[PDB]
Amino acid sequence: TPINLVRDLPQGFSALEPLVDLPIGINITRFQTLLAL
Amino acid sequence: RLFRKSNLKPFERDISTEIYQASTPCNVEGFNCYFPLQSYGFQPTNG
């Protein structure tokens, strides 16, 4: 996005474009972000 | 796998060795709770 705005999210619109689908399946849950330091 | 708590969904894998409680709860072999897996007697003599 061109996202810069001022504060919080703006009133705009756009959409994703999928990249890949890999075969994990196997009951996926508990997504966890990897924060840096 | 001969025992499982709940039926697996289509295209699902169960490599876990979770012991099943097939009515007396267990915490564990011989009777009423077994190793989930069971082996095949594949022998040439088998029909």
The Cα B32–Cα B20 span in angstroms is 9
Question: For residue A26, what are its two tokens?
Answer: 């196997």
Burial class (CB in 10 A: 0-12, 13-18, 19+), A35: exposed
Nearest CA in chain B to A23: B11
Nearest CA in chain A to B12: A26
Instruction: Give the number of A-B residue pairs with CB atoms closer than 8 Å.
Output: 6
Question: How many CA within 13 A on the CB side of residue B36?
Answer: 13
Write down the experimental method used for this entry: cryo-EM
Q: How far is CA A16 from the centre of its chain?
A: 9
The experimental resolution of this structure, in angstroms, equals 2.5
CB B21 within 8 A of CB B8: no
Burial class (CB in 10 A: 0-12, 13-18, 19+), A6: exposed
List all residues 6 or more positions away from A1 whose beta carbon is below 8 Å from its beta carbon.
A12, A14
The Cα B1–Cα B37 span in angstroms is 4
Does B7 contact chain A (CB < 8 Å)? no
